[PDB]
Design a protein around this ligand. Structure first.
Ligand SMILES: [U]
Ligand SMILES: [U]
Ligand SMILES: [U]
Ligand SMILES: [U]
Ligand SMILES: [U]
Ligand SMILES: [U]
Ligand SMILES: [U]
Ligand SMILES: [U]
Length: 517
């Protein structure tokens, strides 16, 4: 943390943050969500990290170079250490990235190494080559070298993500799935795991072995798993919680902005809210059905009337303000909702649906006051505008993610937030073979458009190809875009260091501090 001259620090430097739900895991190769990543950043540190405003900056790697954007060499700082005092080396990274690639690990982020194009990854994921053939090597204890199969100018931006953080081989091998228990875990970020009570709390304490430990201010941070946004706000206002999670309750938001305006932080966020259609399941394998659902949803009502927190109506998957996005707004987005509804009803009529044999399916969402209110609104809109019936179903966060991976669903609410600020952070997740593809969408034309983006060595051709990739996704109605998120949360006046400038919201508790109050 960089405490400004003249600020007086509180005697007790502890922080309590709400974190939305119980995490899937603390193992960096088994996680895929925001709640998980929030804790991961305080515990595991990769080659690069985001600074307080979001810029890619030195992590374990203090400096790096590239040859032709294809061979990347990372010089690791000599004092990087794990919490047990052992050095962090390039061998930790070789083992870690191989473990991420290995199909036996079944990482939901195994495809992250395809997004960076590390050599031999396709073959490794397919089981044709062992994970030890991955294009990584330790040239020495402090030098990690990555070889890509084609030039990737933005490759280093990918490296702040939890999937490419190191994991401690000896703990993994000795304890298997219990390596992340407090008595067994070993970490290399600014914090160490002190306590982990499922469905109650996660408590982290400063890691004195962290190389940048002299600059860490917060000595302990607790992450809570509260999925009720009302309860989160209530426990913030009662004094228990210093930072809420960033899901705000429809019941209280407008009142909160009038009551404690300086605490309500609302900033740009590179996430898209959408309804994920299971593309492989009848009748959702019919484009007419997907298009109908997409069109009949009234984004103005959802965004301006039901949520009303500053989000923007969406007509794409990639947010239009992503660095490198120059998207073309489809004509259907400029039609009236009435015209959208007529087109929707006609397509369902064409698809074989009638008043007597209507379209009925499930709408799955992770337990939440906000997502339940949004799902109820969407259900009513779809009923009214299109004559479709939906059965709402809630599931705890971890189970919800697994259901979508299993494809044991019809439609599900969903949010994707960038991992790196570049359109492929979104678009690569719709590739046929992507491990993050829970839409179960498979388009050879879409796959080709993205594949062509690294075959050109020009930004304008790349941007035009992303725009066309979004047009292919839209033409196929792979998803139902709802809105581009704003990042809205409550933050006590005494929490310093949170700028709100990072559009990815990659917060590190090592960068915060408690002002005397
Ligand atoms: U004190
Ligand atoms: U106090
Ligand atoms: U470039
Ligand atoms: U650049
Ligand atoms: U940029
Ligand atoms: U269903
Ligand atoms: U509620
Ligand atoms: U106080």
């Amino acid at each position: 943390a960089d405490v400004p001259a003249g600020v007086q620090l509180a005697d007790k430097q502890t922080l309590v943050r709400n974190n939305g739900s119980e995490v899937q895991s603390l193992d960096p190769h088994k996680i895929e969500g925001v709640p998980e990543s929030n804790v991961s950043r305080d515990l595991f540190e990769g080659l690069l990290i985001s600074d307080v405003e979001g810029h890619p900056s030195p992590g374990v790697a203090e400096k790096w170079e590239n040859k032709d954007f294809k061979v990347w060499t990372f010089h690791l700082r000599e004092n990087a250490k794990w919490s047990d005092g052992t050095p962090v080396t390039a061998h930790d990274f070789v083992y870690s990235w191989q473990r991420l690639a290995d199909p036996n690990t079944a990482s939901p982020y195994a495809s992250y190494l395809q997004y960076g194009h590390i050599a031999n990854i396709d073959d490794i994921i397919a089981g044709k080559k062992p994970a030890t053939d991955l294009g990584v090597k330790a040239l020495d204890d402090h030098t990690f070298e990555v070889t890509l199969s084609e030039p990737v100018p933005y490759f280093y931006k990918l490296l702040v993500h939890p999937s490419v953080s190191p994991v401690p081989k000896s703990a993994v091998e000795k304890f298997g799935d219990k390596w992340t228990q407090p008595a067994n875990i070993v970490t290399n970020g600014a914090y160490k795991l002190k306590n982990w009570v499922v469905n109650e709390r996660i408590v982290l304490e400063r890691n004195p072995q962290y190389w940048d430990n002299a600059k860490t201010v917060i000595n302990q941070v607790t992450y809570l798993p509260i999925s009720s946004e009302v309860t989160d706000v209530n426990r913030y206002r009662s004094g228990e919680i210093d930072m809420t999670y960033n899901n705000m309750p429809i019941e209280l938001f407008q009142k909160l902005k009038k009551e404690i305006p300086n605490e309500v932080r609302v900033d740009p966020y590179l996430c898209t809210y959408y309804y994920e259609i299971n593309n492989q399941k009848a009748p959702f394998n019919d484009v007419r059905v997907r298009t109908a659902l997409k069109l009949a949803l009234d984004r103005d009502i959802i965004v301006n009337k039901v949520k009303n927190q500053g989000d923007l109506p969406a007509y794409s998957y990639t947010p239009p303000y992503t660095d490198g996005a120059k998207l073309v707004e489809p004509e259907w987005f400029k039609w009236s909702q009435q015209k959208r509804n007529e087109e929707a009803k006609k397509l369902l009529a064409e698809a074989g649906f009638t008043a007597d044999k209507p379209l009925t399916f499930d709408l799955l969402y992770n337990t939440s006051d906000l997502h339940k209110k949004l799902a109820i609104a969407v259900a009513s809109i779809w009923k009214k505008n299109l004559g479709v019936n939906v059965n709402l179903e809630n599931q705890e966060w971890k189970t919800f993610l697994d259901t979508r991976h299993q494809g044991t669903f019809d439609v599900a609410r969903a949010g994707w937030c960038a991992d790196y600020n570049e359109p492929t952070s979104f678009l690569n997740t719709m590739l046929s073979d992507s491990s993050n593809n829970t839409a179960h969408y498979k388009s050879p034309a879409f796959d080709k458009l993205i594949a062509d983006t690294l075959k050109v060595a020009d930004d304008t051709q790349r941007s035009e190809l992303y725009a066309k990739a979004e047009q292919q996704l839209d033409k196929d109605s792979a998803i139902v875009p709802v809105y581009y998120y704003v990042n809205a949360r409550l933050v006590k006046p005494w929490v310093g260091g949170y700028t709100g400038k990072d559009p990815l919201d990659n917060i590190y508790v090592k960068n915060l501090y408690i002002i005397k109050h």
